[PDB]
Amino acid sequence: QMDFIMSCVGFAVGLGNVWRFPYLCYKNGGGVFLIPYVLIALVGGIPIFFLEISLGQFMKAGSINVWNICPLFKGLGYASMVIVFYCNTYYIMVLAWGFYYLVKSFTTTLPWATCGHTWNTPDCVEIFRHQLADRRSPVIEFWENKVLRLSGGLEVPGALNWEVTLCLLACWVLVYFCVWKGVKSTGKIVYFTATFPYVVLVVLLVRGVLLPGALDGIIYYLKPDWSKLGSPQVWIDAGTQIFFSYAIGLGALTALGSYNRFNNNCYKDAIILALINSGTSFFAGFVVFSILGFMAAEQGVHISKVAESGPGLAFIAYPRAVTLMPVAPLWAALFFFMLLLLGLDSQFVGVEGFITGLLDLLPASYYFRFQREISVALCCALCFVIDLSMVTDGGMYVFQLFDYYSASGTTLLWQAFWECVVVAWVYGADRFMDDIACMIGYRPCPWMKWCWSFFTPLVCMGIFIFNVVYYEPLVYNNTYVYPWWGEAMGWAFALSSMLCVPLHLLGCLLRAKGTMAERWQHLTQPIWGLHH
Numbered sequence: 001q002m003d004f005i006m007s008c009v010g011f012a013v014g015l016g017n018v019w020r021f022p023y024l025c026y027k028n029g030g031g032v033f034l035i036p037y038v039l040i041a042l043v044g045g046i047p048i049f050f051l052e053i054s055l056g057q058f059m060k061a062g063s064i065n066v067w068n069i070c071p072l073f074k075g076l077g078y079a080s081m082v083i084v085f086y087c088n089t090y091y092i093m094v095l096a097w098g099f100y101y102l103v104k105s106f107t108t109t110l111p112w113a114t115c116g117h118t119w120n121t122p123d124c125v126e127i128f129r130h131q132l133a134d135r136r137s138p139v140i141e142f143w144e145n146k147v148l149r150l151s152g153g154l155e156v157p158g159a160l161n162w163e164v165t166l167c168l169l170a171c172w173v174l175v176y177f178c179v180w181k182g183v184k185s186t187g188k189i190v191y192f193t194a195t196f197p198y199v200v201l202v203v204l205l206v207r208g209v210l211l212p213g214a215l216d217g218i219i220y221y222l223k224p225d226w227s228k229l230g231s232p233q234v235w236i237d238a239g240t241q242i243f244f245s246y247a248i249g250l251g252a253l254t255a256l257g258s259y260n261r262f263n264n265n266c267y268k269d270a271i272i273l274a275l276i277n278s279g280t281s282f283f284a285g286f287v288v289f290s291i292l293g294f295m296a297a298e299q300g301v302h303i304s305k306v307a308e309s310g311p312g313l314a315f316i317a318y319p320r321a322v323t324l325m326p327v328a329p330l331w332a333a334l335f336f337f338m339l340l341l342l343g344l345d346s347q348f349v350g351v352e353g354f355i356t357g358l359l360d361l362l363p364a365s366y367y368f369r370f371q372r373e374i375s376v377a378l379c380c381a382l383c384f385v386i387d388l389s390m391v392t393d394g395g396m397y398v399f400q401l402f403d404y405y406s407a408s409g410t411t412l413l414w415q416a417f418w419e420c421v422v423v424a425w426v427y428g429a430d431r432f433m434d435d436i437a438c439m440i441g442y443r444p445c446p447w448m449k450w451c452w453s454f455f456t457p458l459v460c461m462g463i464f465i466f467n468v469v470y471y472e473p474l475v476y477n478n479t480y481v482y483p484w485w486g487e488a489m490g491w492a493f494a495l496s497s498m499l500c501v502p503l504h505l506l507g508c509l510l511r512a513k514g515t516m517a518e519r520w521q522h523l524t525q526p527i528w529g530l531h532h
């Protein structure tokens with residue numbers, strides 16, 4: 001079906017499946033991460049994915065207009081906008097690093113194959129003997145000393161990195177050119193971009209399985225650690241990983257639903273997209289953890305300490321796989337080209353959605369002469385100004401605050417929980433089921449309304465409560481504990497995303513008159529379109 005490919009290439013299959021899931025699994029521990037993943041996917045992931053798709057189909061509108069079913073909660077739309085903005089702030093940053101790798105890929109010998117270069121510390125060696133626990137692989141040296149120039153901590157920003165600055169600027173001007181032109185990957189390149197990733201990954205997997213110690217890595221990836229289930233860290237990471245990789249709460253899924261026709265088979269669409277996202281994430285995990293197993297066997301250090309536990313694992317594992325290929329530079333170019341294409345597709349969708357939302361928000365009186373190009377130029381420039389913070393020596397640290405807090409973390413649980421509450425307890429789960437039955441003819445499984453009513457909200461609330469009760473300060477690469485101001489800034493992002501719903505609530509309550517009950521009922525009266 002068109003929806004399948006449109007969503008896959010669009011903003012469903014992307015870095016969140018190839019880059020995010022790997023290091024989330026690595027940080028939480030390989031096997032133990034999978035149980036909350038599948039549990040949330042069956043309980044929170046699939047139901048909310050279906051919710052957003054079919055809500056977009058029903059209302060035939062995206063952005064905030066989709067909440068005309070309950071204008072009193074229209075604030076969720078605003079919240080989504082904020083979230084996607086933060087996403088667009090740091091998502092592109094990954095691309096910059098990837099772009100940098102691509103630029104350094106075109107060489108007879110890859111930069112991260114030998115460590116005899118200038119920036120590499122004397123504590124390195126190309127091949128490892130059976131000092132111990134101190135030697136650093138050339139790939140991590142290239143990732144940190146050169147690509148990142150990682151500083152002591154977030155307290156010290158350091159000197160700006162000009163090469164990554166230029167690469168990020170190139171990514172942003174490319175985003176500007178494509179969004180303004182509206183490339184949309186044509187119609188056949190779409191198909192190519194739908195099938196180009198897996199192919200490359202497949203090759204890696206074959207090489208991945210043909211390595212010493214890849215079995216240890218894969219059993220670490222699969223066999224759960226039953227002790228770790230107690231901590232809420234795994235549950236928050238898995239729930240937010242699904243709500244990120246599925247793009248839950250970012251408003252693009254409602255746009256996908258609106259693009260679809262009213263008479264469409266949305267249930268099978270949602271199930272197959274969930275299966276594709278989960279399977280692509282699982283496949284990327286296969287590749288990454290096979291590579292980690294090979295590195296653990298070759299280093300001699302334990303699997304849990306081989307690579308960086310932060311966002312850089314996808315740039316530690318995947319390039320190493322390329323070094324194992326016969327023609328290394330060609331496969332480096334191919335892999336990083338596919339990664340760049342995936343990121344650009346996702347970022348095009350996100351930036352286009354954000355621009356459409358802003359232009360919808362702004363009244364007709366604020367009609368700029370060049371509103372399209374002016375708006376996209378301002379958004380790109382502002383995002384670049386914010387991104388200058390993540391390019392600095394300590395900038396990687398800020399990226400973590402944009403990863404754990406701005407989009408993922410507590411804010412996504414809050415958004416999804418309020419989604420469930422507004423659609424099920426306010427609008428009416430049974431009435432919504434009747435609407436779905438009218439839309440698609442037949443009726444979905446009762447598991448869906450059970451999930452929306454008192455399963456997904458309860459699970460999200462429980463993870464939230466276990467987080468706040470047993471709060472742990474965020475730690476980067478299990479080495480650097482964040483200070484109170486970094487936590488404060490991350491929570492500033494979190495509250496900026498979360499407060500959109502309660503503040504818009506109080507705003508509507510104040511703008512309304514009379515007794516609280518009657519005005520709350522008036523403001524929550526659904527507003528129907530011409531079709532229904």
Ligand SMILES: CN(CC(=O)O)C(=N)N
Pocket residue numbers: 011012013014015016017087243244245246247248250346347350
């Ligand atoms: C745009 N993306 C990337 C992804 O799908 O992982 C969102 N999660 N929204």
Ligand SMILES: [Cl-]
Pocket residue numbers: 016017021241242245246277278281
């Ligand atoms: Cl995923």
Ligand code: NA
Pocket residue numbers: 011012013014015016017244245246247277
């Ligand atoms: Na995804």
